[PDB]
Amino acid sequence: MYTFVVRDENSSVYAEVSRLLLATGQWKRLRKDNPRFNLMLGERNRLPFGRLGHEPGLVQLVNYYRGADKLCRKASLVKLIKTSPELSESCTWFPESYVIYPTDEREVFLAAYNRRREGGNVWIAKSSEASEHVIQKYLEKPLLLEPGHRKFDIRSWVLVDHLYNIYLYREGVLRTSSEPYNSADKTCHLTNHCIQKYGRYEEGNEMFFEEFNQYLMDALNTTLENSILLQIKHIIRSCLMCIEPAISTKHLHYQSFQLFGFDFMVDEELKVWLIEVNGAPACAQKLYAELCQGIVDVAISSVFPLATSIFIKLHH
Amino acid sequence: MRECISIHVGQAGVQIGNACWELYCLEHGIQPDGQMPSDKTIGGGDDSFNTFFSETGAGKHVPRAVFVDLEPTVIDEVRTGTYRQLFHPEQLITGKEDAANNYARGHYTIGKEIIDLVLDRIRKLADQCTGLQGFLVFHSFGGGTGSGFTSLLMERLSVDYGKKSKLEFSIYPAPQVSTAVVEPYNSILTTHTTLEHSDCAFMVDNEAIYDICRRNLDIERPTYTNLNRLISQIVSSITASLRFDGALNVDLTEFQTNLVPYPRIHFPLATYAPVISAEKAYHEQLSVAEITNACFEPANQMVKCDPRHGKYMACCLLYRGDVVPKDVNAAIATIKTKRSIQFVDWCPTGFKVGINYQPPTVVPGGDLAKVQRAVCMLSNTTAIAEAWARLDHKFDLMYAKRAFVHWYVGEGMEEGEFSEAREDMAALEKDYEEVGV
Amino acid sequence: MEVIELNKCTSGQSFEVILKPPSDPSLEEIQKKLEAAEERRKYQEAELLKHLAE
Amino acid sequence: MREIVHIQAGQCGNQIGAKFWEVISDEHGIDPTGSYHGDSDLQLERINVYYNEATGNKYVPRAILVDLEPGTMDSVRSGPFGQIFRPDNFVFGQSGAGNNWAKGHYTEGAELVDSVLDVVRKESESCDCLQGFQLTHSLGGGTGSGMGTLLISKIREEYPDRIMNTFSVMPSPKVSDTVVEPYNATLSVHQLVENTDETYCIDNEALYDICFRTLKLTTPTYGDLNHLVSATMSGVTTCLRFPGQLADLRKLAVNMVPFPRLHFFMPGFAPLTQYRALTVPELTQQMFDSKNMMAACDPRHGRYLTVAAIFRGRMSMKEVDEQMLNVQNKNSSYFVEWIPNNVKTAVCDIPPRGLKMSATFIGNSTAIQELFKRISEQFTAMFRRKAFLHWYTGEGMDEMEFTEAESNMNDLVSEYQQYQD
């Protein structure tokens, strides 16, 4: 049989994955601190990558890429997009952003804000006036769904395997608002399941791709693939190819894969903007089984084999 | 001219020493009987090779070396080996009963009984030097002698030769080629006792040498001979600057000036290329750019770790063969554009380069093929701290149950030495984290 | 990309390439620790011999 | 670390000891007269570990034969290799010990022990660098059990810095001579806990079960059991006797014994004794199987602290490594995690007689507690009625000594249970 361990009890995705692996009959779970394992479902923080790949006779695999935190932390994502010549800040799909400490970019952020304020501009900060961490431009003109006059975000799940193939899960999720967008209460400005909880138009304030595509057809005479998906695939490919030399495990003594959650925003001109990248994302109940089984087939059995695909391979 | 004395301790230190001195004799044109037909100054000289070889009136070139082991089997190989005529009997020191893989037995019980004899033979070597530089010390981490006796000897050498430099070549343990379950204990104890007495130490992980022999030489089950010939090529590139004419690393203090900005962080990472099998009647000759690029692949490092996730404090490139500076500089420019080489911000981002025109030498009939050019990179990177972490974790696993501790207390040690040594290692890991961020 | 300190001899050459500027215990004490360890071995062996005599 | 001094005491001890010397003498090419007639030089490289070299190029075993009655040693001297032993190394009395630990340890044995020590001293004084001693005996009788443990105590007093190793045969009601065997065995186990560094536990119950169930022997004799024992003894001394990459008794103790009292080893052997050679996966699977264990304990009822395994014959090192790593990775639950890399593998090109390949297992397992539990129960069932105690109080012992032996045994059991959890 094959060997795996579990070191994160809060991951619903990998709890399902481990359950499926036990439902295979060829995988068996070990105590969390047993070093003789083939597969590690590791912890979120301080994952001891240095201890992997030193067990004689074991091919060892882990569900995280060391160094991928640069893409999944907000300040480091800003710094990466600004300082990487492959992105060079001049990329058209990431909002104008500056990192501020409580080098510092305070003088430059206020400097560009001086040109922006005279005309307007509204900004956002997390980790209309500047006097009142990362501060980036708040997209004041988002695409609003009708009926409802409400905003949304797009969550895409992306699997990167040990060969650095990039797989885009065919099913994404729009996380929508319920209250009409008011550009003058932050519930209509903020798209989050927890914040919304509601549930009038769709179940759980989340709409799936077939329905959203039919809406794009009927309302705007276009398709989701043409108006949005080309941009999403381009952004994913750029972000991951950019850091490939820093995180690739191609000639390394252990191997990595990882599941990412990309979050996007669409403006009223059908332009896609990358909001953020999640390194330990959740999923949708209707998609847990499919996506997890796909994780097993494409990420795990590809290295440890047993006795149409749901992914789109983003060539590069 | 200033002499260097080599000291080989325990089985690993002795066998590696034999491989090294064989390679030295092939490189300098010294026959197994000690004669050197290219040396026109008979019975003397202050040439570069005289840093490692003295001369007798009969024209014999004798290594400035001493071999020490607590059991006689391994040094008896030297006594009847190919280069037996090279050494005098006083250079070979053996005991009767080894340290049974127990640091406490090598350091306390047995070391107290033989340390004065060893120092006396070393003193006999020092009396023949007109300006001794210091010592090069070869040993394993895992053996009872290699760990325990070496730590004691290093303390006494600091006492008796205060101003001399001391460099180490240390064999870090790997279960693929392991001999005892207590090797983590011995490794930590000897690093704690030796840290303050070593100016610069080159660690070689047996796991890395093993994997390079299996992968590049296509040897399914590498022996100590294969491992030691590869290791001896590495050591030879590191000491060639002392043995030949040149301007870079021409004395032991230069190793510290060039590679070690803080005293405790004195463990440079060695990477070597190319390693090509002799069985292949033809292989393509790698250019300067290709071997320089190969210096940044983990699979060619002497210790397995990921330099992409650490920071550099110094870097030295040591070339041998058909190499000119123009190609080195072009290659470095390409590597800088294609790789992530981050230095600490309080160090310059430079590379020190040395080139010896004589291409590497290989033992006839050995496993290494003759190549036109080779390179050994010595870089002081925080990424090597991974090896410490691995080791420390194994320590923590056994010591939490006090497994095997009674064997050390039984020899006169106290439990406090275990925790003291472990706390020193924890402080070392802290130092590497602070420098590496 | 500055090359500095080029030294050339018949055996080879060396130089430096810069890409960016920057941004003991005594002998008596040793004898003391050794002798203390020996004394502890001696005490343990005396306890053994006392046990065997009982 | 060169010479080993061998000692065999009592009926069982002398019978398995004689078989051991017959087997390893055949392996090293030594004929019954002490002359070397071998073909290879590997058999002579480390022959001094067990043999002295006498003028005329003769090899004499460094062995001492002890008993309180002459019968078994008379049969040894007339055995196949009886002529090879040094005649002065036979030390014997006439009274016997009557299957009585007190007679061997306190009354009859005390008279002969000083003569034995004189011979031990004479053999040790000619050693270039003595490693220690190996003793063969049973625990259920009187001479090997009582006088054997007395001897171990005296030897430790004179040579406190040498290793003490034993092959100790554990009694069983299935292969029993007298009802007092649990008394003798319980008294001896406390001595072994204090005064040996390594003890191989040879359980007569397991030997009988192997002869009956596996070897298909309806009526096993002591000879059939001693065939298994001698095969095992050759296996476990292989790496002491042949050029090995490692061994000696001290490095064995250091690597196998993490806590001083827990030094009782469970041995195993494969294949169990036809013209077809076993493949490496078969050797590895059988060598870890309970049915190949020489102590009647289920390893799946405990955990391995340390393991050593020896492969003999011409085979693939790569396949051996792959199979050993295979059984470790597939049975990782039965190995303690707090001792990293606790399984050691060795290979010797010279196979034993009549086999093209073989494998020998040495395990330090907490499941050995079952053995001690069995003995403890049989002790208590009699001792709570003080049955058969007069045989012992008549030699000067008191009931208190029995109470203390029982308490010490149950302490050993509880210590094993402590490290099993």
Ligand SMILES: Nc1nc2c(ncn2[C@@H]2O[C@H](COP(=O)(O)OP(=O)(O)OP(=O)(O)O)[C@@H](O)[C@H]2O)c(=O)[nH]1
């Ligand atoms: N690379 C290499 N490693 C060796 C060699 N010999 C032994 N080792 C390693 O050294 C460690 C064992 O220590 P040794 O040097 O043999 O032991 P020792 O210093 O002789 O000490 P004692 O024998 O215990 O008295 C293990 O990690 C071995 O893998 C060798 O020739 N080459």
Ligand SMILES: Nc1ncnc2c1ncn2[C@@H]1O[C@H](COP(=O)(O)OP(=O)(O)CP(=O)(O)O)[C@@H](O)[C@H]1O
């Ligand atoms: N520049 C911007 N313009 C418009 N809306 C923005 C915005 N930045 C953030 N938002 C809104 O705020 C929401 C959450 O911002 P944020 O990027 O911090 O997600 P989050 O990290 O709080 C939870 P998640 O892991 O799902 O991303 C987004 O879904 C979006 O609706």
Ligand SMILES: COc1ccc(OC)c(CN2Cc3cc(OC)c(OS(N)(=O)=O)cc3NC2=O)c1
């Ligand atoms: C099959 O081999 C042997 C057979 C019989 C043996 O006695 C007669 C020995 C002696 N021993 C045991 C041992 C066990 C280890 O582990 C439990 C160990 O540690 S290890 N894995 O190499 O790291 C190192 C050793 N060194 C030794 O000489 C070895």
Ligand SMILES: Nc1nc2c(ncn2[C@@H]2O[C@H](COP(=O)(O)OP(=O)(O)O)[C@@H](O)[C@H]2O)c(=O)[nH]1
């Ligand atoms: N395996 C084996 N066990 C024996 C042999 N002889 C006796 N025994 C066992 O040893 C115990 C009897 O002790 P024994 O050695 O005969 O008594 P002693 O002469 O006083 O030491 C019982 O458990 C017997 O089953 C033998 O040749 N082989």
Ligand SMILES: [Mg+2]
């Ligand atoms: Mg987030």
Ligand SMILES: [Mg+2]
């Ligand atoms: Mg040794």
Ligand SMILES: [Mg+2]
């Ligand atoms: Mg009997």
